[PDB]
Amino acid sequence: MFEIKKICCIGAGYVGGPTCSVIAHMCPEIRVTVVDVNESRINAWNSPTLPIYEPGLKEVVESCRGKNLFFSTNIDDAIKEADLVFISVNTPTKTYGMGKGRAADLKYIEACARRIVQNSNGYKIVTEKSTVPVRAAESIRRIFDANTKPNLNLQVLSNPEFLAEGTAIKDLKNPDRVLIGGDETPEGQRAVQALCAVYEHWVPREKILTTNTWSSELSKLAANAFLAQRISSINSISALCEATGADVEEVATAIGMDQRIGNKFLKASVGFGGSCFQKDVLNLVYLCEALNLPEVARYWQQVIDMNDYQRRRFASRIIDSLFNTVTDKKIAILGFAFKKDTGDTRESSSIYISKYLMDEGAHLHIYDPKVPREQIVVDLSHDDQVSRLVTISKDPYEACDGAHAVVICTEWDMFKELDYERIHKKMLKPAFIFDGRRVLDGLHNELQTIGFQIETIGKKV
Amino acid sequence: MFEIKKICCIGAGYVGGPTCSVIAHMCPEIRVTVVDVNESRINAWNSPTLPIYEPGLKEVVESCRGKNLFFSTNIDDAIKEADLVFISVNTPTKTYGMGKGRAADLKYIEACARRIVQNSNGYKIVTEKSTVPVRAAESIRRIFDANTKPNLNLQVLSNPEFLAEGTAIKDLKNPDRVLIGGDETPEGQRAVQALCAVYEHWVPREKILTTNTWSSELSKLAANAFLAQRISSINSISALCEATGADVEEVATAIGMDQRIGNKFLKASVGFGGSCFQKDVLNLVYLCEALNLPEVARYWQQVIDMNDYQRRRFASRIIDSLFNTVTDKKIAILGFAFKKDTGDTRESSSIYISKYLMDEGAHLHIYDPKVPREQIVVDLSHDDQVSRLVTISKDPYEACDGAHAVVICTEWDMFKELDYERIHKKMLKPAFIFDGRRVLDGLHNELQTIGFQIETIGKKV
Amino acid sequence: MFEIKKICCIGAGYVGGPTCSVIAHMCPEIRVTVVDVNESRINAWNSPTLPIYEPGLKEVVESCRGKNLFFSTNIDDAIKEADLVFISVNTPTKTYGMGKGRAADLKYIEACARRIVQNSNGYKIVTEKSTVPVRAAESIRRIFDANTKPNLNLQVLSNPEFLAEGTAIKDLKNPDRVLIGGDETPEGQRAVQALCAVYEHWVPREKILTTNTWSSELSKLAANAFLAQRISSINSISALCEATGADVEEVATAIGMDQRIGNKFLKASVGFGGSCFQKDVLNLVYLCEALNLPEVARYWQQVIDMNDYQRRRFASRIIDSLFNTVTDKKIAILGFAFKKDTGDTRESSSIYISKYLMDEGAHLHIYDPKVPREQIVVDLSHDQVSRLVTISKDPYEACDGAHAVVICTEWDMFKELDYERIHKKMLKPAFIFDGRRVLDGLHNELQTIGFQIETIGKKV
Numbered sequence A, B: 001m002f003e004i005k006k007i008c009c010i011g012a013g014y015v016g017g018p019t020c021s022v023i024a025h026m027c028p029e030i031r032v033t034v035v036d037v038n039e040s041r042i043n044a045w046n047s048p049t050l051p052i053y054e055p056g057l058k059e060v061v062e063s064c065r066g067k068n069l070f071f072s073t074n075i076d077d078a079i080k081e082a083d084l085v086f087i088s089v090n091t092p093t094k095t096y097g098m099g100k101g102r103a104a105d106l107k108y109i110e111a112c113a114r115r116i117v118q119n120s121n122g123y124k125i126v127t128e129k130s131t132v133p134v135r136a137a138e139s140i141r142r143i144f145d146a147n148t149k150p151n152l153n154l155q156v157l158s159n160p161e162f163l164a165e166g167t168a169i170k171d172l173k174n175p176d177r178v179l180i181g182g183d184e185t186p187e188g189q190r191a192v193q194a195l196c197a198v199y200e201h202w203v204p205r206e207k208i209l210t211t212n213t214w215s216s217e218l219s220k221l222a223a224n225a226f227l228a229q230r231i232s233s234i235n236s237i238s239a240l241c242e243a244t245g246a247d248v249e250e251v252a253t254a255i256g257m258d259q260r261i262g263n264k265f266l267k268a269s270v271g272f273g274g275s276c277f278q279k280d281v282l283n284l285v286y287l288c289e290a291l292n293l294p295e296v297a298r299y300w301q302q303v304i305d306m307n308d309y310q311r312r313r314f315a316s317r318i319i320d321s322l323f324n325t326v327t328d329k330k331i332a333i334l335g336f337a338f339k340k341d342t343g344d345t346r347e348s349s350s351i352y353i354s355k356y357l358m359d360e361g362a363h364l365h366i367y368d369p370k371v372p373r374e375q376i377v378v379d380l381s382h383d384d385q386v387s388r389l390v391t392i393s394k395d396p397y398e399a400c401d402g403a404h405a406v407v408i409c410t411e412w413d414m415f416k417e418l419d420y421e422r423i424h425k426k427m428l429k430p431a432f433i434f435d436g437r438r439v440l441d442g443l444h445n446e447l448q449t450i451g452f453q454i455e456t457i458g459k460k461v
Numbered sequence C: 001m002f003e004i005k006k007i008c009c010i011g012a013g014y015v016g017g018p019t020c021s022v023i024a025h026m027c028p029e030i031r032v033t034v035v036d037v038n039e040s041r042i043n044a045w046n047s048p049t050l051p052i053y054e055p056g057l058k059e060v061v062e063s064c065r066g067k068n069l070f071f072s073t074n075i076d077d078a079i080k081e082a083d084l085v086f087i088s089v090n091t092p093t094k095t096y097g098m099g100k101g102r103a104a105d106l107k108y109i110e111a112c113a114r115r116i117v118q119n120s121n122g123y124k125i126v127t128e129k130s131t132v133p134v135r136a137a138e139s140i141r142r143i144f145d146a147n148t149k150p151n152l153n154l155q156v157l158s159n160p161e162f163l164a165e166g167t168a169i170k171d172l173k174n175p176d177r178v179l180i181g182g183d184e185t186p187e188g189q190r191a192v193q194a195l196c197a198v199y200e201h202w203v204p205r206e207k208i209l210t211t212n213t214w215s216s217e218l219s220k221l222a223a224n225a226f227l228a229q230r231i232s233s234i235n236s237i238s239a240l241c242e243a244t245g246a247d248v249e250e251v252a253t254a255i256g257m258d259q260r261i262g263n264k265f266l267k268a269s270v271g272f273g274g275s276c277f278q279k280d281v282l283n284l285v286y287l288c289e290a291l292n293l294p295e296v297a298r299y300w301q302q303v304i305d306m307n308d309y310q311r312r313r314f315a316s317r318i319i320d321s322l323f324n325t326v327t328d329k330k331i332a333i334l335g336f337a338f339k340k341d342t343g344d345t346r347e348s349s350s351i352y353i354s355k356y357l358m359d360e361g362a363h364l365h366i367y368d369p370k371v372p373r374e375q376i377v378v379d380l381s382h383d384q385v386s387r388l389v390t391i392s393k394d395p396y397e398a399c400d401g402a403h404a405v406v407i408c409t410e411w412d413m414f415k416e417l418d419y420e421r422i423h424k425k426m427l428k429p430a431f432i433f434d435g436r437r438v439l440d441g442l443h444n445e446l447q448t449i450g451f452q453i454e455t456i457g458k459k460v
Ligand SMILES: NC(=O)c1ccc[n+]([C@@H]2O[C@H](COP(=O)([O-])OP(=O)(O)OC[C@H]3O[C@@H](n4cnc5c(N)ncnc54)[C@H](O)[C@@H]3O)[C@@H](O)[C@H]2O)c1
Pocket: A010, A011, A012, A013, A014, A015, A016, A035, A036, A037, A038, A041, A075, A088, A089, A090, A091, A108, A109, A111, A112, A129, A130, A131, A132, A161, A162, A163, A164, A165, A275, A276
């Protein structure tokens, strides 16, 4: 049996940093080196202020960093020395060319594959952790086959990642499962078993699934598409509730008590964000179109279409409720991160609601407890319109001071705890609360007594 | 019988220069003066370097120029002195206004008609050689009727041109036929017969067709639409072949051995280019829409739609074969002219394939034995993107050095003769050849043995 | 080199019968046995009146029948003895299920395949003679592979038919080309070569083209599609001519003089008919949809849509000319066959023009010199035939009391009619609608007699 003793991870992002940090923490005898082309990111990983906010992450980094955990921009030597190389780079939707707005952008992956074969000799396992179109591993194999050297044996595995931001460390330390894909050849199964032996330092063997390479790639896309679909489905139900007097939280509970459906991922929202759900479903759609599966393509597209309807109609709700015009109206945006317990804003609904209201010429005042203000400025920029229409607030009370509406977009715990009596006093009248997260449930009577018009998703006005 | 002794041709382009050069060469007693508003074009026609590359043209110009062949920017005196005035100006698709992207732009023609009546006295024959919408001659007539002078007799004829670039001189010296259109009046038939007498110096009378003005105008559009259609039809068959394992060259041969179909214009390609096929079919389409013939309009539109599918899918082939990403990938473009034996690039498929690959951020290195590099730069410009993504190569080996793919777009003879063993050595791996012209047929086994992945149109991978 | 000396042909129809008769006639040293399940058809091939009428066929058949040409219902013995087995059965359009109206039905081909493998030992060459969908040869190979025996070697070839109706024997004796497809293996190439040697008894080697099997199958459909496309293209041009003062006959001459275009199949018409063109183009379109080639499917669909528009617009011209009402108006239809010199009416434009006028309540009087009146009744049946349709014994009957004379088939006799006689007994205004451009050159005098003359691709 081959033993992995040095690991290199190309990509020091929300996946690469935490995954490697937990591997190093659980496997004291394995050297783990996380690398990136981004110098300031790598410099931040080596500093008292990590480049990402993830609960418990700093404690894990600090326990291992400089012992068996390293962050470096020296990609070549980290590859050269490694028994195992992870590819954990970004795979965004292409914003250009063929498949613009749908297809996965594989240029970061290809760059990794080229760099690996350029800097590799002997035996190495190359593990595709990035979320990819099905069969992407076949292209990494072809590049390696076409660029062999004497004694160079590069084995390719699929090892997709299931962590959610905000709960990364817990997800990594106690995963529901680990999935590994490789071919059925003797060398392929040897590679699989070596990677399994890494995870077995802390994951029970019954929680490690081994499949073929393509089932593993597909499983990741499917898992994300099923999760996103649960949200779009309950969000579709929120609209029906609003029209009927049914309550979406009541309905969610009823359906989720069926053990075959389950009670998770039935929290209605202004819409799902985060870097991957939309892009991974669109990748699935694009791939289906390419494989002449248009029925399957249009089935999954509904998940994205619903999410976009949820958001748009939430924005329309705000504008319709505020007498059909929001031009020059101060509006508080409470929450800019895509979910609580992260500073990540990638595809946050907060961005889409903010842009909709900015198209109207609203004056947005934006508060979030963890997102840096510079990121919010970048997200809302194409910027003159940002300088004219957007203010980043230091606290929520400042945001709401002289506002017409408070719009809650991220389910930070603090928001339900605010002093709404104080807030109502300095708001323009009538004062509105638009709750995109159902976090103010149970406060509606008190809020109404104070004087607010309170509206939320999945509840009839 | 009236005898034409002085000819003026307005338009010194790919039609006007060669047609007039051959008339002068065949009719030593007729003074032929080619005129243009473009000074540098006219200056080039008077120089050792003609403004166009056409086989055998220089020999014809040089034998007559300064004897009975003249090139001049003095349009007014050339008209004033002429027995016969040719209109041989450009008729591009309108890029603006009503019919943008479809309708013919008749502003150059109208300018000629106005200038002719302004500078004409006595008897002259005015011959519309430019490709025009049907009934355009009626407008030239109306302008003349509305601007008569005492003793001014301007007779209007249709005399469209059937030469193909690359074979212009041969086509002009030995035409399959000459077509002349005029009205059935005594003066009209007199004009027709005078123009016939010019061509009879070298074209047998049985190869000179005389029709009415509108049949003649329409015949030119129809002829071009039938030719373009043969190519789009065999290109449509190329796609079916790729899907079935049939070979398009085999199928082309089988169908073309039916004497009713004929064996010409069945060469599959990345797509037909050249200045006229697309614009003349679109003119036909537009005209049909204007005459309430939408069924006829949509029949002919298929010829353009097929051509655009052929090109797009060829580009998609390249990107799909190169692991679904070509960003930063060096790619050799061999051939930029729209067909071999011309330096003309007007509507070359090379432009469309290059632009598709540039949209992806590919690094194109472009070689062509006759197109000037300045023209390729203009064609690919909207240019920063050109400065970043495009290099004009001095030879094909330079183009292919460190390239991922060689893409053949123009059927220059030299390309099949290249040293592909040498080329494979310095290509990045795996190395691809994409043959848009079927010029490497028969070399596939040798190329595969060298190591290439070779793909071509109308052949299954 | 392998010599073929016994040929069996499964299917004694319009393709198989004549093809095999010519082979026997040209190759005296080959025994050619044509077989069929249809016993009365086989018995007719051995009779003084053959079950297929083609000029020259009777003479070819009678020259070698009983010598080296045989017709039999004994299919199993013919297969068993054959070096080469032609599959020349019909592949009719599916009238049901997947591909209804467009897909070819392969049931007969498959039956033959199963029967061949069942009755075969050793080496045989099996050749698709009938028009088939692309990759039909692969199904035959699979049936053979699944049903193999020791020493069984069945090589599958494609060898399409290019017979035009009424000229089959001349097409057979002097073909533009012979097309043979086989795979590019040693065995497939010896099979191809063995069949080439048969055709070489009368076809120059330069006119025999050998391809792969799929190329061969696809070439037959593409050929008919290119042919039908020339007709739809010149017809589309005919409509523009009428709108612009151009003449489609002048335009056809002008474009046909380009040797890259050529001068055949540019005769504008009310629309192409026949049992082949629409069927083969629709099959091609269905194959494209099945292969996920939608751009290609709708490119070729235009050939059919243009043909259908040519017929539709011609009927509407008739109706609009007769003041937009033809209820109980007598109209003479001259020509019902799909082209001249035949009684064949299959997919004839005359059917479609007649049905359009029937839908308006017109009283049609139909004359054709060769189409049997019984066929006309069937073709115009689904009620309205007995009510609206009369089959005339001569053109003058048909035109008597008529509002319009409509020429749908290009029979040479129609330009020889006594149009002064016709005009006298027609209701006024009297119309002639020439759907075939047969009365060109009578236009001046017909106008003087007093007709309103309407033709395709010209305003007279
Ligand atoms: N973020 C999540 O919650 C999550 C969860 C599961 C899976 N994933 C998948 O993991 C992958 C990475 O996600 P992420 O959120 O960490 O992205 P990220 O953008 O935050 O990090 C990727 C890093 O890779 C670097 N990189 C790109 N190309 C490089 C190259 N050629 N050489 C060296 N470094 C390079 C970038 O600079 C960046 O720092 C994606 O494919 C994603 O779909 C993400």
